[PDB]
Amino acid sequence: GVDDRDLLLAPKWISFLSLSSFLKQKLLSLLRQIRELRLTTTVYPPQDKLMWWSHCCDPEDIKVVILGQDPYHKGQATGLAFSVDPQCQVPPSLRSIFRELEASVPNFSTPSHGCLDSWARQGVLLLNTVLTVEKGRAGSHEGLGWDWFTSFIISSISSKLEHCVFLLWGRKAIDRTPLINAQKHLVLTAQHPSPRWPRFQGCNHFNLANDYLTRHRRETVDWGLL
């Protein structure tokens, strides 16, 4: 009943997630609502980038899941959490991320661009918990219906893979904790990187992720490859 291409997800992710006909409908209805909203408002990112994160990663090659809130809201959003097009300045959140890598990861030097696609090809999944935002208004799609979808993805990665690392940054990312199997994975939590939980400055998530990865005979992430 559902043309799987209307789901926008790469097909490796369709089979991995193996959404029921019901959940595919639920997703299609949300996608339709977003389209209708685009007639009155500007929504970021473009419709064709909402699932960009599925096109960069085969789901089995995931090593690290990084989870954000909602997309950048002033043009910068690419479809990958925290990443920016080369047309745009590195926003405060990514500058702060780089500052932590600069301070913590040997030979990391801060790039003049904010493109995180290199992390994606090394098996870092850069996921927002809410995949859209109205231009200008931060958090403005918070209760529109993305949450079941991103929660479903996090659960499936946790159930289907072994020994991934999840870096959960800020309250909404951290809410997904109960979905991740404590006997198989590592979760590291911090306060959100933009200026209750541990401070982001000093969290050392990047070296800790790699420590865990190397320990499970998996290949590290080269965070400085950008």
Side-chain angles (χ1 to χ4, degrees), residues 1-28 30-32 34-35 38-39 41-48 50-57 59-68 70-84 86-106 108 110-133 136 138-141 143-170 173-182 184-195 197-198 200 202-216 218-226:
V2 173
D3 184 335
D4 283 0
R5 301 172 298 180
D6 283 317
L7 303 167
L8 305 191
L9 287 162
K12 279 168 212 177
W13 282 90
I14 302 291
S15 15
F16 187 73
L17 290 176
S18 56
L19 298 170
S20 60
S21 355
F22 177 94
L23 294 169
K24 292 182 180 171
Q25 289 300 346
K26 187 171 196 66
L27 179 55
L28 291 182
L30 169 67
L31 291 171
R32 188 148 301 117
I34 288 152
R35 259 203 272 97
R38 286 179 198 274
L39 304 160
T41 69
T42 299
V43 181
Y44 294 125
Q47 195 75 359
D48 71 1
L50 306 173
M51 310 298 174
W52 195 247
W53 58 265
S54 63
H55 293 282
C56 274
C57 255
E60 262 106 329
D61 295 332
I62 290 161
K63 294 182 189 93
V64 182
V65 178
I66 297 178
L67 201 59
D70 63 336
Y72 298 130
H73 54 104
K74 327 188 214 208
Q76 313 93 332
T78 66
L80 233 41
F82 301 105
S83 204
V84 310
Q87 303 315 300
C88 304
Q89 302 286 348
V90 184
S93 296
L94 190 58
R95 272 144 54 195
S96 165
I97 301 302
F98 293 160
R99 220 173 280 123
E100 175 63 10
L101 291 153
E102 177 68 64
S104 69
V105 178
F108 178 91
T110 289
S112 74
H113 69 91
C115 191
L116 300 183
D117 294 331
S118 301
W119 289 3
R121 293 181 288 272
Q122 293 181 79
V124 187
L125 176 63
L126 289 153
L127 195 56
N128 290 309
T129 51
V130 170
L131 297 187
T132 52
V133 67
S140 61
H141 279 188
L144 193 71
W146 283 114
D147 288 284
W148 76 270
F149 182 56
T150 63
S151 283
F152 184 87
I153 296 168
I154 291 149
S155 185
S156 311
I157 289 161
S158 168
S159 317
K160 289 200 162 82
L161 308 184
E162 313 214 343
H163 311 326
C164 304
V165 184
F166 300 76
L167 310 180
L168 303 182
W169 294 339
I174 292 168
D175 285 342
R176 312 293 142 145
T177 298
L179 305 171
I180 295 154
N181 187 311
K184 299 171 75 178
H185 305 300
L186 185 62
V187 173
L188 297 173
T189 62
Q191 292 177 338
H192 196 275
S194 73
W197 309 289
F200 186 75
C203 75
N204 210 27
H205 279 192
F206 308 101
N207 293 325
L208 281 160
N210 277 347
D211 187 71
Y212 186 85
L213 291 169
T214 299
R215 209 205 333 298
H216 291 97
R218 313 194 66 190
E219 54 280 61
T220 53
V221 179
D222 187 335
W223 305 99
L225 193 53
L226 294 159

